[PDB]
């Protein structure tokens, strides 16, 4: 029961790295140049 993903990242301990979108059928979860110095 969902039209889109959600939030992440995928960096674990005290890191903000890596995310997702939320579109109708587009992007799932990916980091994207998100943070260029941690993956």
């Known amino acids: 029961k969902e039209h889109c993903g959600s939030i992440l990242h995928g960096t674990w301990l005290p890191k903000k ?3 997702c979108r939320c579109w109708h059928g587009q992007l799932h979860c ?3 140049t ?3 110095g941690c993956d």
């Open 17 to 19: 790295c890596s995310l």
């Open 34 to 36: 998100f943070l260029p």
């Open 30 to 32: 990916l980091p994207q």
